[PDB]
Each structure stands twice: as structure tokens, then as C-alpha cells.
Amino acid sequence: IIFPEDFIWGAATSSYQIEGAFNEDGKGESIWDRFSHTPGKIENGDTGDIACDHYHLYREDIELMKEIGIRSYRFSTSWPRILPEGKGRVNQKGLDFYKRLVDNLLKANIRPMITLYHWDLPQALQDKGGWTNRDTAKYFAEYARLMFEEFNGLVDLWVTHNEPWVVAFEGHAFGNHAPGTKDFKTALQVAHHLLLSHGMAVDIFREEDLPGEIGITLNLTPAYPAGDSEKDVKAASLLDDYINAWFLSPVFKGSYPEELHHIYEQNLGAFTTQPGDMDIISRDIDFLGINYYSRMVVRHKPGDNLFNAEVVKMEDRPSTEMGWEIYPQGLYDILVRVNKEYTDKPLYITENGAAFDDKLTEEGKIHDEKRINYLGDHFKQAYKALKDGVPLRGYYVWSLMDNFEWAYGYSKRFGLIYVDYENGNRRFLKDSALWYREVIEKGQV
Ligand SMILES: OC[C@H]1O[C@@H](S[C@H]2[C@H](O)[C@@H](O)[C@H](O)O[C@@H]2CO)[C@H](O)[C@@H](O)[C@@H]1O
Ligand SMILES: [Cs+]
């Protein structure tokens, strides 16, 4: 179990989850500022107002990155911190923060990967319809161009979008995430525009002629039927397409998955598209980022979804604090499936990790054995994928540090680093952090 010498071992975060400084130095309001300040939306009424205060503490966080020995740091940039209204004026202090951050990363020999959109849409753009407005895709493209030009020669790994499935469906169908809408047709229109905006950014990446590589990051959850019933098998297949193929087929094949597209259209009516959209959505990219956490086991059951599909709770199997099944085999399955059915391009696991009930000792120790076991077990499946020909180039752990976990607030801890919010926001390396350092150095698990 030795990994390639040049394998990119990293850790990942996102802007709203760690930065804080929510209305400081010219920053505009995001849909997540608004959502978290709306009653009943976040566990315990938590907000990302301060979070980990990374906006002020970034220099200390980079020292901690150095202690862990990560080769690359994946982070997202806040669109409303840079263009407060989404379009219009640039906020120079906002841009300046990311410039300092990138400079500091490069001086520590840490390779930056930027995610352009990790869910924090400017509220001014939401007031004009947000992702159901085709113009939002244009403004995203303009924001991308601004960042490409600013970091030309400085950042060589770029991700347009993080988890467009979640943005579309949790944000607009089920209303669990900002902006809180609950309309399945809206979600489908939003998915289309996220994909369009991705392709528009790729076109701009090519034109600007930056050194480096661009991709998109998709959450992928492989589905398994509960039993050999073909109704079970069909239901699993449909749920699987609903999360996975719905984004993988347009990016790589230039079409929505046919059976699912037909079912949506017949029952809901068509969402609005223009001729040529699929050509834009399917522009050639340099890599695919995969975010993996768990699988779903699926059976056929009466439900208020078009699939009559139920996700089965696997009560008999180890799970995390999220209640998610621990199923490392799924990581192998999904990497192999992508490489066979969709693309021969390089792959990166841009997220994988776990929440456990972390206990900070009086001396600042966190003995997170369960996270070490979780990470090592998934590392081994990644190795197995490499052994079998999958061009896996790197692996970023979610997350570098504990943070604002959206609707769960601070109650869920995914970090390699413990953040003691109550006591000056001090950081403590968990045992998994020093265990990870050993993995990176030896290239072995
Ligand atoms: O979306 C499901 C569930 O995910 C967890 S973890 C989450 C990270 O917070 C997000 O930044 C990353 O890109 O994706 C993973 C999976 O979506 C999140 O804490 C929780 O609120 C959310 O409901
Ligand atoms: Cs049909």
C-alpha cells in the first residue's frame, strides 16, 4: 500500500463554512447570510457570522497546514465578498484577502485549488431570481473570468462548481439549504443553469489561456438495490440517475439521462433550454472532482416521489454522527464506474471524510480513532482503484478544520483540526491530523 510519489494529498474547506467576517470590509450579503438569519432554518440558531474566523486567522491556519504536510489546499472563493452585488463593483479588500491567502500558500509550498462556487450566491442576485434566472449564469461566467485573470500564473487547479445536485435539490426542491425554495420544477431549472454556467466558465478558461487545469466537482452516491426484485433494481437505478447521471451525462455525453429526462418531462413539463446549451455544458474539461461519503441502499415502496423509491436505513452497519453508513467499497465502485462509463480524464477525490463525536481533552488532545479508521479504510479503496487502472491523481480530506456544517450548524465536526469556538477560536490538531501527516510522508497506509 504505497501511493504514487506525486499523488496530491490535500484537505478542503469552503468560504461560508470557515471565513466569518460576514459583513466586513465591503462584503455583500449572501443567500446563506439571509438563510441562517431566518428563524427555524439552522440547528440551535447557529450562523456563519463568525464561524472559524478564517478571514482573520488565515496565517495561523496555513502554519497548521504546514504541520499536517498537505500538498494541496482546496478552498472556495466568496462571490459576494468579491462582487458585493454579484455584478457591478469589485470589492478590492475582498479580492485582497484571497491574494494574501494565495501568496501565503505558495510561500509554504502548498498548491492551491480554487472552487469558484461553493453555494454562497450573492443575495442581490437571488432577489432577481438567482439560479432560475439565466443571467445568473452569465454573471457567474464574468466572475470566473475576473478570478482567472487575477490568479493567472498563481493558481493552476480550478473547480467551477461544488455539488450542483445539492445546490439544485436541497436549496430549491426540499428547502433545506439556502435559498430555501421547495419546488421540484424550480430545482430542475436551477440544475440546468448551474451546468450552463459551468460550460460558460470553461470556455472562458480556454480563451484566457491560463496555465493549469479546470474541472467540476460532483457529489456521487452509488445506489444498491435492497434485493433481487426488479422493482428494487429499477428503483435503485432511478435514484442513482437522479443524483449521478443527471450531472455526469450532460458534462461528459452532452445529454441528460434519457429515461429520467422522459419521466420528468412527462410528469412535470419541460424546463427551459436554448439550442446549443448541451454543447456548452459538455465542453471538454481537464479533470473530474468526485465527492464521496456513503452509498444508498434502495427498495421499491409507495412514496410521494416519481420513482417510488425508498432509501433503506442500514441499522446493522457502522455509521457516522450524520447517520451515514460507512461503506468504503462504494468509493471504489464509483471511481471504476466513472472511468468505464463516462470519462478517461484524470480524477480527483475532491472530498471525503466523516463526522464523529469529537471530545477535546483539557490538554487539547482529540483522540479521533474512528476518523482514522474511516479515512484509512477509504484510502485503501482509492489504492485499489489505482491498482486497477483508474487515473486517480489526488485525494482531499473534508475537512481541514471543524466548521459551520450548513443546516446542522456547529454540531457536526468533520475536521482534521478541532476548532474551539467558545475559547478564542483556538485550533487543536486532532490525532487524525498527525496520522495523516505520516500517511503523506511515507506515501503508505
Ligand atoms: O449535503 C449533505 C450533508 O453534507 C454534510 S458534509 C458536506 C460539506 O459540508 C460540503 O461543504 C461538501 O461539499 O459536501 C459535503 C456533502 O454534501 C453537511 O455538513 C450537511 O449539512 C449536509 O446536509
Ligand atoms: Cs414513457
Side-chain angles (χ1 to χ4, degrees):
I1 310 180
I2 299 274
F3 282 79
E5 185 180 325
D6 67 338
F7 197 69
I8 302 172
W9 292 108
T13 61
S14 84
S15 52
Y16 188 77
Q17 298 182 267
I18 70 174
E19 283 179 2
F22 80 110
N23 62 5
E24 185 171 339
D25 297 336
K27 167 168 178 306
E29 189 182 26
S30 74
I31 59 167
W32 272 99
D33 297 313
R34 172 73 63 91
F35 195 68
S36 78
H37 286 92
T38 305
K41 306 298 190 191
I42 314 297
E43 199 175 300
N44 297 321
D46 290 346
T47 73
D49 281 9
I50 298 178
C52 307
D53 199 23
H54 172 79
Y55 181 85
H56 298 100
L57 298 176
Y58 68 99
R59 299 183 291 272
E60 174 181 6
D61 291 337
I62 291 176
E63 288 302 319
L64 290 171
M65 293 175 210
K66 279 155 75 182
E67 280 173 51
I68 299 181
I70 57 166
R71 289 168 185 180
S72 184
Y73 172 58
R74 170 176 181 243
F75 64 97
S76 80
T77 47
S78 172
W79 184 358
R81 193 184 294 289
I82 290 154
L83 292 138
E85 304 288 315
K87 57 181 189 61
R89 295 174 61 186
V90 169
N91 177 29
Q92 189 67 55
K93 289 199 157 220
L95 215 37
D96 282 353
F97 162 69
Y98 298 114
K99 288 165 71 166
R100 292 192 301 274
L101 174 64
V102 169
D103 184 44
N104 273 253
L105 288 165
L106 295 171
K107 281 167 181 164
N109 195 27
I110 300 181
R111 187 171 179 192
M113 171 191 276
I114 293 178
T115 301
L116 288 172
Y117 185 79
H118 199 130
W119 308 0
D120 45 347
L121 185 73
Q123 176 67 30
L125 289 183
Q126 183 61 39
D127 289 339
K128 295 195 186 306
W131 291 107
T132 58
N133 193 336
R134 197 181 172 95
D135 292 346
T136 298
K138 298 292 180 25
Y139 295 132
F140 176 77
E142 288 176 20
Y143 155 60
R145 193 191 293 275
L146 182 89
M147 303 300 282
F148 296 153
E149 299 197 56
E150 189 65 40
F151 296 100
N152 190 340
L154 299 170
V155 173
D156 66 14
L157 290 166
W158 296 87
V159 173
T160 58
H161 273 278
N162 178 79
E163 305 190 349
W165 182 91
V166 179
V167 173
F169 296 99
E170 299 296 344
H172 302 78
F174 307 119
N176 284 315
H177 284 178
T181 314
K182 306 186 190 196
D183 183 340
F184 200 84
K185 281 189 72 28
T186 297
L188 296 178
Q189 187 67 66
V190 163
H192 187 69
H193 291 161
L194 297 167
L195 286 167
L196 186 64
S197 80
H198 157 75
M200 289 171 73
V202 176
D203 276 356
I204 284 171
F205 192 79
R206 305 312 185 190
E207 170 189 9
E208 287 292 342
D209 202 43
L210 274 77
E213 304 170 89
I214 188 165
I216 185 168
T217 274
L218 302 180
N219 57 291
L220 302 180
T221 298
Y224 304 76
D228 61 356
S229 188
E230 295 199 336
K231 277 296 183 181
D232 269 18
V233 184
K234 177 182 220 212
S237 178
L238 281 174
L239 260 191
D240 194 296
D241 289 344
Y242 153 67
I243 304 188
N244 307 322
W246 196 255
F247 298 90
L248 284 167
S249 185
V251 170
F252 295 112
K253 295 184 169 186
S255 72
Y256 287 106
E258 187 70 32
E259 179 179 22
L260 202 48
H261 180 87
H262 169 81
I263 291 167
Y264 286 154
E265 174 151 354
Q266 284 240 279
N267 290 278
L268 307 179
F271 49 92
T272 301
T273 63
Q274 289 176 19
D277 282 358
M278 304 309 309
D279 287 323
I280 297 174
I281 294 180
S282 55
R283 297 295 198 219
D284 197 51
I285 53 180
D286 300 315
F287 68 87
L288 175 65
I290 296 175
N291 293 351
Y292 178 86
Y293 295 89
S294 192
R295 66 161 170 182
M296 49 193 179
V297 178
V298 190
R299 66 171 155 245
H300 178 281
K301 201 162 163 305
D304 264 9
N305 62 84
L306 289 161
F307 309 149
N308 304 279
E310 194 195 18
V311 181
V312 180
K313 182 101 178 172
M314 302 300 289
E315 298 223 274
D316 48 315
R317 308 255 163 134
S319 68
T320 73
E321 277 301 284
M322 302 296 293
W324 300 344
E325 181 182 8
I326 303 173
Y327 194 73
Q329 299 73 17
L331 178 46
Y332 176 83
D333 289 353
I334 200 59
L335 286 174
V336 169
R337 189 210 298 184
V338 168
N339 173 81
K340 295 291 188 40
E341 305 183 1
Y342 294 96
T343 187
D344 64 351
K345 296 277 182 166
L347 303 184
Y348 290 82
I349 290 160
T350 42
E351 285 177 21
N352 171 249
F356 290 104
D357 190 14
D358 293 318
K359 260 33 169 172
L360 179 73
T361 75
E362 283 77 350
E363 287 75 31
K365 307 288 190 276
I366 310 83
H367 301 306
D368 54 339
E369 281 302 285
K370 284 180 165 164
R371 186 172 292 105
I372 294 178
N373 295 337
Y374 181 100
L375 291 173
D377 281 4
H378 289 75
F379 286 1
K380 282 167 197 165
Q381 292 301 317
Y383 164 91
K384 189 168 176 297
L386 268 169
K387 162 190 151 278
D388 294 351
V390 178
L392 182 62
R393 299 293 181 242
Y395 193 126
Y396 294 79
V397 169
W398 186 270
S399 178
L400 173 64
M401 62 183 79
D402 302 334
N403 63 67
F404 181 85
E405 293 289 349
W406 311 112
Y408 298 86
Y410 302 98
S411 74
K412 300 291 176 297
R413 290 180 182 274
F414 277 92
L416 292 164
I417 296 170
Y418 188 96
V419 184
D420 191 3
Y421 310 105
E422 292 322 310
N423 298 110
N425 242 307
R426 44 182 195 200
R427 286 93 158 98
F428 294 99
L429 291 187
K430 310 181 181 168
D431 286 351
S432 58
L434 300 182
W435 169 88
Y436 195 24
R437 174 175 68 210
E438 174 165 1
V439 170
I440 297 167
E441 286 179 317
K442 303 184 177 169
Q444 77 186 6
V445 176

